[PDB]
């Protein structure tokens, strides 16, 4: 759910540094 990384945290919430593959 943060606004710094380039992928997704929790299904639609925002972005992540560790991307869930």
From Swiss-Prot:
Disulphide-bridged cysteine pairs: 1-13, 7-19
Entry superkingdom: Bacteria
Keyword line: Disulfide bond, Thioether bond
Record location of the 3-cysteinyl-aspartic acid (Cys-Asp) cross-link: 1-9
Residues passing through the membrane, by range: none
Coiled-coil segments on the chain, per record: none
Keyword Disulfide bond (UniProt): yes
Function: Active against HIV-1 virus in vitro.
Name this protein carries in UniProt: Tricyclic peptide RP 71955
Organism listed in the record: Streptomyces sp. (strain SP9440)
Source taxonomy: Bacteria, Bacillati, Actinomycetota, Actinomycetes, Kitasatosporales
């Amino acid at each position: 759910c943060l606004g710094i990384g380039s992928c997704n945290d929790f299904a639609g919430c925002g972005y992540a540094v560790v991307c869930f593959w």
